[PDB]
Amino acid sequence: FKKPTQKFSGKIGEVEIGTGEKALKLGGESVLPFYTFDGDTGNTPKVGMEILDVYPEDWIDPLKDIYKDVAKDPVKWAQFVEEKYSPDFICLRLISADPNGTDAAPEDCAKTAKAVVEAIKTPLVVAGTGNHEKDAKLFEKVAQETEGHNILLMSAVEDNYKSVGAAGVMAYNDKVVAESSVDINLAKQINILMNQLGIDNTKFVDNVGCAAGGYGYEYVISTLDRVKLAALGQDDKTLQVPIISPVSFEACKVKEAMDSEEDSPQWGSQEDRTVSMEVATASGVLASGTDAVILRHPKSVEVIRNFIKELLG
Amino acid sequence: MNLFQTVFTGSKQALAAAEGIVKQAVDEKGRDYKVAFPDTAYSLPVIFAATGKKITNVGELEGALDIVRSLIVEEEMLDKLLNSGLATAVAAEIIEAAKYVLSDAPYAEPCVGFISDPIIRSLGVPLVTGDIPGVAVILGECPDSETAAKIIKDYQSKGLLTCLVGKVIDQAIEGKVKMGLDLRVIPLGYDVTSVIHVVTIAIRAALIFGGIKGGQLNDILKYTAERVPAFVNAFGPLSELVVSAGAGAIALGFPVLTDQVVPEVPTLLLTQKDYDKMVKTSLEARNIKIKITEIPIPVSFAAAFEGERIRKNDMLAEFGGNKTKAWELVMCADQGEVEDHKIEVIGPDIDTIDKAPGRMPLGMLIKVSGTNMQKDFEPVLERRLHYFLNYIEGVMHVGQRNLTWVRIGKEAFEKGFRLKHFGEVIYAKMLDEFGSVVDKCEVTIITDPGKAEELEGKYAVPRYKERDARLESLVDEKVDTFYSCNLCQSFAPAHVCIVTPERLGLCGAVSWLDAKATLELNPTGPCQAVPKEGVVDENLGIWEKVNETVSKISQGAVTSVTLYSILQDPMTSCGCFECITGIMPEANGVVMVNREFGATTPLGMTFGELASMTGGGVQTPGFMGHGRQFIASKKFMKGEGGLGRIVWMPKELKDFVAEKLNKTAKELYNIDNFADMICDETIATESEEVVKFLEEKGHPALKMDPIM
Ligand code: SF4
Ligand code: NI
Ligand code: NI
């Protein structure tokens, strides 16, 4: 029999997030994920930890027990996460800027992000809310305040891609995430718009969408497969950027993880179900072609890091 | 003194002033004294842009005079004139740099002098997003303070960033113009050389946002010409130095407007004496468009208001339908024929109604003017009218062309709705949605019985007839490009639709003109042009360019396709197709089935099984998914003898298609009623019975060569 020699003409580009000795690089691979028997895998996929700019009230009880004395102050929370768990990066989610919730001015969130980014050495990812109009102004003020640290700004959708691209990559030398909703064509369109704006493939990453296991997950898997095959096999230049997936954003929000043992006695431990959901979603997206995953529970980060080390090592 | 000599003279004067002030800096501070601008990383931006060199000491500032000298070549050709304009810009920068060397703070408020890099990054984001529509560089002096204040505040009210040089700074102060960075009214300085401080803004915009390294002068000039929407308004008498500095603005792609008599250059140097039109002249000259924030209508306008049904007894007004004559039309017109934002209501308005219902003719004539506007784009925009009107609560409009009727309830009348608001909404939405193809829009609402019918006959019906004629007369050979749509790749990863004049998109909602309009309006959308070059087989419809485009779009899943055949590398199908065509070998022909048909077919499979086998973006020879307009096409199965092979078809589909099918088969030289030779489900459904019917009726398909 002949060994399967799958030669790809394409190659994923590298994007650097952060400054100093903690800065990480994403992308650089020329084969399918964990296909060390086919060629070169550029950089190991990264695992980041999610923190909030306000106290997490909807999080499960074990998570609030882990961060009991640090979740009140985002700076203290970030320092605790960097010290005790030492992740690849920290994703600071500005929940307080949500128009649906306790809407806050962009200045307050920018100040919180500036305080956080000057206390940690690991790369920081600043994630906004689901509102495009709010996101544009928020990221303007956040990128203005957090200048000189090479942060990553999430959710630069087509509605506000110009604003986040200008306030981000162009003005204050940051990186950005071009987000598209589970479509290869939409990912191509947003990448082409970013390139025509003046931002090359070395200055942004892609978010082809994320979903928890069992909730539109096959669409995420198929989108990741199609994007990876087009970028590598077909040498499509508009898709040769690393992909980042926020897993904890949707994985921890589902009923299979949020419900406590009191609500569903047969299901069992709530923390175990949350960790299992995070691990399953992260493993699937990592196998399908993502380059960085955002997780919430520290045990999930440990399990996913061990999984990556076992597969690559 | 002609234009070239005026510019050369000005550049020499700029060089003379630069040499004199540099000599003062050398004598007072020495060649080792530091040269810098407050808070910038680009040293002197113009010199850094042109040469890539950073100037740090006075001795290098003196050596920068050679750059000015090398840029002044007194030969009357356009390139030398632009280089001489750049010589003035470099000389002005050297003068401004020496000002900071000689005096610690050379600018006193209100003048700001040099603009630091953090300010550029602060206003750079609005420049990219269009929140700042443009940069108005106003220099000189207006005939009076109020004229300057009016023009400046006109630019300010439109969101433009205006910079001031010269006596207009004092005139604006006398005119009480509120100056500030947040107020977007920046006075640079009273000297002409202070105009370099807004020039470096455009230069550093290329350096910061364009990512262009220093010394790439052509790339920087290209960037400022395409990306920086700056223009110059030069008021008052213009010296040679002012003209040479304007040549520098022209060198950066910024048009220069003035109220003085000058040797005008089209699109670059323009004279506009009318101060009441200078703002509009500049916006047109710089291609600047100001977007409308909200629709000026008392009635609320939202997309959720579509589909509202409003009571009959509340119908204040009702136009169109079987009661009255109503029509709508969107027509391309030359710039002279349509004036921007002109809503004309002719005839009685809805106020005159004093009875519970209303009954009067309504005619909406919409004229759109633009550089890229085409007649083929008219049918698209007109369709959006249906939507533009339905988003207004209180009014419901449905119909096509002259078949439209509009019902207006009395709640909108109580709120203050009139017929002019129709024009306001139409103009605002035409400039929003089609702002890339429409420059000016004029809406006329006609209610008089006479003018409504006169304008319909003069304008409406000829447009409809020519549109129908173009739709019917377009063939593949006449056009030179096809189009490719991949909108169904969301569920069919390998499907690429090739739209030609005689092959409609199999979803049935995309045509060749629709694809062209979609490509024009949404260049990064799903519809992309496919040049029809490199033909291989004209009868089977094989093009090398088409194969290459299909291979690229489908991510290599599909290699070769044939447009006019179903047995040799057929086109793929996704799943939106209305009809399925399948090969019947025993009849030496083809049968068809629509999605509304539930019974079995002579092939032995229902519509569901055929859809499962055919769709999904897979090349299946012998089966095709297509729309209802493709059956009576001359390109239908052109690679297998044409549409004469159709032997079985559902009764309702046959009744729907019969007229056009008989026309095309008459082109084939068949009988007047060719559809009678086509078997129905009622006549016969079993294959043997179908073949018996075909033999009895003398179907042409039985007498052709074998299909496969
Ligand atoms: S079926 Fe219609 S929408 Fe789908 S790809 Fe073809 S032309 Fe586009
Ligand atoms: Ni389709
Ligand atoms: Ni389809």
Side-chain angles (χ1 to χ4, degrees):
Chain A
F1 70 96
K2 271 68 211 166
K3 209 70 171 184
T5 304
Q6 190 175 26
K7 295 300 300 182
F8 283 151
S9 55
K11 184 178 184 62
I12 304 300
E14 294 189 354
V15 177
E16 175 136 33
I17 293 92
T19 55
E21 184 177 3
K22 284 288 191 302
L24 56 85
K25 296 190 298 182
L26 297 176
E29 60 274 358
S30 58
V31 296
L32 293 184
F34 310 114
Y35 278 47
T36 62
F37 44 88
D38 277 1
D40 170 76
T41 60
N43 295 278
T44 67
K46 310 302 180 184
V47 186
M49 295 251 296
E50 173 196 11
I51 66 171
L52 267 46
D53 69 331
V54 292
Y55 180 83
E57 200 60 40
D58 67 294
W59 287 17
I60 64 174
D61 292 306
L63 282 171
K64 300 192 297 179
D65 175 79
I66 292 178
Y67 306 118
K68 41 161 178 289
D69 47 354
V70 295
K72 294 178 179 57
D73 194 3
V75 181
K76 299 287 292 302
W77 194 356
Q79 291 180 181
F80 174 84
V81 167
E82 184 189 23
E83 186 70 74
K84 183 172 176 56
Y85 307 110
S86 181
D88 290 331
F89 61 92
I90 300 180
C91 176
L92 175 67
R93 195 142 68 107
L94 307 175
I95 297 298
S96 57
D98 197 331
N100 290 18
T102 168
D103 187 0
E107 295 81 38
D108 308 1
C109 301
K111 172 180 56 56
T112 301
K114 184 182 181 299
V116 171
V117 80
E118 292 168 4
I120 59 175
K121 307 303 193 63
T122 62
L124 184 68
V125 177
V126 182
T129 175
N131 198 42
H132 309 335
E133 304 78 62
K134 190 65 173 57
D135 273 7
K137 312 245 70 173
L138 171 62
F139 283 136
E140 263 159 13
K141 189 82 206 96
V142 167
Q144 189 207 146
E145 288 277 31
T146 64
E147 181 182 8
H149 295 274
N150 193 20
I151 71 167
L152 184 72
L153 302 169
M154 293 200 75
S155 287
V157 302
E158 183 190 2
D159 305 50
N160 57 255
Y161 81 94
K162 316 191 72 173
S163 182
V164 187
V169 184
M170 283 180 161
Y172 302 101
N173 314 314
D174 293 329
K175 302 294 180 295
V176 82
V177 183
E179 179 180 357
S180 105
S181 34
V182 291
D183 217 304
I184 176 183
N185 293 127
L186 296 186
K188 290 171 53 59
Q189 184 175 9
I190 187 60
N191 291 10
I192 292 174
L193 288 176
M194 298 289 285
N195 290 282
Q196 292 177 356
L197 188 57
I199 305 174
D200 50 318
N201 286 15
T202 63
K203 304 243 162 293
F204 68 95
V205 301
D206 242 324
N207 184 15
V208 304
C210 185
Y215 298 84
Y217 197 64
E218 79 273 41
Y219 298 105
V220 182
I221 299 308
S222 293
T223 303
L224 283 168
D225 290 331
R226 294 172 66 182
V227 166
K228 227 63 181 180
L229 288 179
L232 293 175
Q234 299 302 136
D235 194 69
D236 187 11
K237 258 66 179 184
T238 67
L239 291 172
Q240 291 178 358
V241 292
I243 301 175
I244 178 177
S245 290
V247 165
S248 63
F249 290 14
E250 310 88 9
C252 301
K253 195 178 54 183
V254 300
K255 181 186 173 185
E256 286 77 0
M258 272 295 175
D259 284 14
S260 61
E261 192 165 356
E262 185 185 24
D263 307 317
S264 295
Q266 70 284 359
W267 279 4
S269 183
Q270 185 182 28
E271 180 185 353
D272 288 7
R273 286 185 281 102
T274 301
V275 174
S276 189
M277 285 293 306
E278 294 182 41
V279 167
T281 308
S283 303
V285 300
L286 285 170
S288 292
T290 199
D291 295 84
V293 285
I294 308 175
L295 304 177
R296 190 179 298 176
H297 202 287
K299 182 57 181 179
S300 303
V301 170
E302 164 171 16
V303 172
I304 289 304
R305 263 210 281 258
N306 203 270
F307 170 80
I308 294 171
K309 180 259 301 306
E310 289 290 330
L311 278 189
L312 287 181
Chain B
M1 182 175 296
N2 61 44
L3 178 63
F4 281 82
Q5 293 307 131
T6 307
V7 169
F8 294 149
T9 296
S11 292
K12 287 149 59 182
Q13 295 174 359
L15 172 62
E19 293 169 341
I21 190 172
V22 165
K23 183 177 177 56
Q24 303 174 18
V26 175
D27 296 338
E28 296 185 358
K29 305 298 179 179
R31 290 181 171 84
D32 309 326
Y33 190 86
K34 190 174 66 62
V35 169
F37 275 134
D39 194 0
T40 187
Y42 299 104
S43 200
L44 310 190
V46 183
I47 295 169
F48 180 79
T51 60
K53 309 177 302 175
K54 293 183 177 299
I55 296 181
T56 55
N57 48 88
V58 172
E60 293 174 329
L61 189 65
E62 185 185 16
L65 298 168
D66 293 331
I67 302 176
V68 182
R69 297 186 187 98
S70 68
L71 288 176
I72 306 172
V73 181
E74 302 203 36
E75 296 166 352
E76 299 199 345
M77 304 287 278
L78 180 61
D79 57 308
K80 285 84 189 65
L81 182 149
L82 302 174
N83 285 322
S84 180
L86 295 175
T88 306
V90 177
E93 185 181 64
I94 295 177
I95 292 169
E96 294 298 315
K99 287 185 179 183
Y100 287 90
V101 169
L102 291 174
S103 176
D104 290 65
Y107 283 90
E109 288 255 325
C111 302
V112 310
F114 188 77
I115 296 297
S116 295
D117 270 328
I119 292 178
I120 293 187
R121 304 182 191 271
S122 178
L123 53 82
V125 195
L127 280 176
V128 178
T129 71
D131 289 68
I132 295 177
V135 182
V137 184
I138 304 176
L139 84 170
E141 54 167 0
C142 292
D144 55 78
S145 299
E146 298 308 321
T147 301
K150 180 269 158 194
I151 289 179
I152 293 173
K153 277 180 284 192
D154 190 0
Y155 284 129
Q156 183 176 31
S157 64
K158 293 190 189 305
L160 277 78
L161 168 63
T162 168
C163 300
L164 294 317
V165 178
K167 301 306 297 176
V168 287
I169 299 170
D170 298 335
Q171 288 181 325
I173 291 176
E174 301 172 30
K176 301 167 181 56
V177 175
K178 305 308 163 191
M179 301 184 181
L181 177 64
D182 54 328
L183 297 162
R184 294 178 178 177
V185 180
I186 296 177
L188 300 178
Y190 297 102
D191 291 65
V192 180
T193 59
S194 298
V195 77
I196 201 62
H197 293 307
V198 64
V199 173
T200 57
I201 295 176
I203 292 296
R204 279 172 288 170
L207 300 173
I208 297 176
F209 312 110
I212 303 179
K213 299 302 178 181
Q216 305 305 302
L217 180 60
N218 280 22
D219 286 65
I220 296 167
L221 298 181
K222 163 186 55 52
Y223 185 95
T224 55
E226 273 89 302
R227 302 288 222 178
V228 183
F231 60 87
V232 175
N233 288 345
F235 296 111
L238 305 182
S239 65
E240 293 108 36
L241 176 57
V242 176
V243 176
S244 65
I250 298 176
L252 267 71
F254 303 153
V256 176
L257 296 293
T258 184
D259 62 353
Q260 305 293 303
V261 179
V262 298
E264 280 183 299
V265 179
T267 78
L268 299 181
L269 183 58
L270 307 173
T271 290
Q272 175 59 265
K273 262 85 68 174
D274 191 358
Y275 299 92
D276 288 331
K277 296 194 305 180
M278 176 57 81
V279 169
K280 282 63 62 188
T281 312
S282 302
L283 302 180
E284 177 182 347
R286 202 34 179 161
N287 292 321
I288 294 177
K289 300 177 179 58
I290 280 79
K291 310 305 295 298
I292 307 100
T293 58
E294 273 278 21
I295 323 297
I297 48 176
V299 181
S300 65
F301 182 92
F305 301 168
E306 181 180 339
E308 175 183 340
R309 265 166 166 77
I310 172 174
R311 309 300 301 275
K312 180 178 62 61
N313 70 327
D314 296 3
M315 296 293 91
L316 160 67
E318 177 177 350
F319 336 88
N322 298 334
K323 290 72 52 183
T324 49
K325 177 182 298 303
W327 56 271
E328 60 177 2
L329 180 71
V330 177
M331 45 151 295
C332 180
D334 305 70
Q335 288 190 335
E337 297 169 332
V338 19
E339 50 275 16
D340 199 333
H341 204 5
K342 197 294 293 278
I343 285 77
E344 179 69 15
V345 181
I346 313 181
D349 205 301
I350 47 175
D351 58 314
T352 53
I353 307 179
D354 48 73
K355 233 281 190 172
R359 212 52 37 77
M360 34 178 45
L362 182 70
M364 301 196 301
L365 185 63
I366 290 91
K367 277 157 159 272
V368 285
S369 180
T371 305
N372 304 24
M373 190 76 224
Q374 299 181 3
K375 296 181 56 179
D376 293 326
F377 299 157
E378 298 175 0
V380 174
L381 278 64
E382 184 177 351
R383 280 194 282 267
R384 293 299 305 178
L385 282 184
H386 169 78
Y387 296 90
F388 292 153
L389 273 61
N390 274 127
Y391 289 160
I392 319 180
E393 58 172 1
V395 310
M396 163 202 297
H397 151 270
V398 310
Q400 323 285 4
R401 300 171 163 185
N402 42 19
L403 266 43
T404 81
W405 72 324
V406 190
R407 296 137 49 89
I408 304 182
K410 50 195 59 166
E411 278 70 16
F413 188 81
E414 298 174 3
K415 292 185 179 180
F417 191 86
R418 286 312 106 92
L419 295 183
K420 60 188 67 176
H421 302 98
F422 270 116
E424 307 294 297
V425 175
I426 291 176
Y427 169 85
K429 290 304 298 177
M430 289 287 176
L431 265 296
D432 288 347
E433 216 158 75
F434 315 98
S436 302
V437 77
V438 180
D439 296 1
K440 302 186 301 178
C441 179
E442 174 194 16
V443 187
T444 306
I445 287 86
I446 300 95
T447 323
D448 286 334
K451 196 164 297 184
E453 61 91 351
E454 190 269 335
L455 289 183
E456 183 186 18
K458 184 195 180 191
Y459 288 131
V461 308
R463 293 302 203 293
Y464 306 152
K465 300 324 149 199
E466 72 182 6
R467 288 169 189 173
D468 297 327
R470 172 156 183 79
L471 267 192
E472 196 68 286
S473 66
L474 251 190
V475 309
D476 289 351
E477 300 80 341
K478 290 167 69 186
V479 305
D480 62 333
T481 83
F482 295 150
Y483 291 94
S484 62
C485 189
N486 59 17
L487 190 61
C488 292
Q489 283 197 353
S490 54
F491 61 94
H495 175 62
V496 185
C497 256
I498 300 296
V499 185
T500 82
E502 283 177 316
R503 173 185 262 274
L504 207 76
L506 48 87
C507 60
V510 182
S511 58
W512 193 79
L513 297 179
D514 268 326
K516 195 159 93 71
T518 305
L519 174 58
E520 179 62 27
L521 301 178
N522 192 17
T524 59
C527 294
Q528 299 294 326
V530 182
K532 191 182 66 176
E533 63 197 21
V535 73
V536 160
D537 195 332
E538 191 70 22
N539 186 247
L540 269 67
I542 308 180
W543 286 271
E544 294 285 41
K545 195 64 180 61
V546 170
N547 290 336
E548 167 188 347
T549 309
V550 170
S551 178
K552 185 170 183 180
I553 295 185
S554 62
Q555 310 295 347
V558 180
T559 313
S560 297
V561 291
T562 59
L563 298 186
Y564 308 144
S565 178
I566 74 162
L567 291 176
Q568 300 90 38
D569 302 359
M571 298 292 308
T572 67
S573 299
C574 39
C576 38
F577 40 79
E578 313 160 342
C579 307
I580 297 179
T581 281
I583 174 177
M584 195 160 138
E586 66 268 31
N588 194 23
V590 66
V591 315
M592 296 179 31
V593 52
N594 61 326
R595 38 183 61 262
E596 296 81 1
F597 195 81
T600 183
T601 60
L603 298 181
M605 326 174 210
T606 60
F607 186 88
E609 297 178 348
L610 292 181
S612 296
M613 190 221 316
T614 301
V618 52
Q619 280 190 324
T620 65
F623 291 87
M624 167 183 48
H626 56 90
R628 283 175 177 262
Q629 294 99 317
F630 190 53
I631 295 129
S633 177
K634 283 173 293 184
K635 291 303 186 300
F636 181 85
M637 291 190 62
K638 185 185 182 183
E640 283 83 10
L643 58 90
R645 297 198 178 273
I646 303 178
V647 298
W648 192 96
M649 181 188 303
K651 175 180 266 64
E652 70 276 20
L653 180 53
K654 197 180 77 174
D655 298 357
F656 175 88
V657 170
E659 301 84 344
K660 302 180 288 288
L661 195 59
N662 287 343
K663 188 181 181 64
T664 324
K666 197 159 304 180
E667 297 300 324
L668 176 148
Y669 203 175
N670 226 315
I671 59 181
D672 184 14
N673 302 323
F674 165 74
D676 76 330
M677 295 165 157
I678 283 169
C679 207
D680 301 64
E681 75 285 11
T682 62
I683 299 178
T685 314
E686 177 86 318
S687 177
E688 306 299 326
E689 320 305 324
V690 171
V691 180
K692 182 189 306 302
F693 172 95
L694 299 172
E695 258 289 307
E696 291 172 353
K697 298 300 296 297
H699 197 284
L702 304 182
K703 298 186 176 182
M704 305 182 195
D705 51 316
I707 180 171
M708 68 189 192

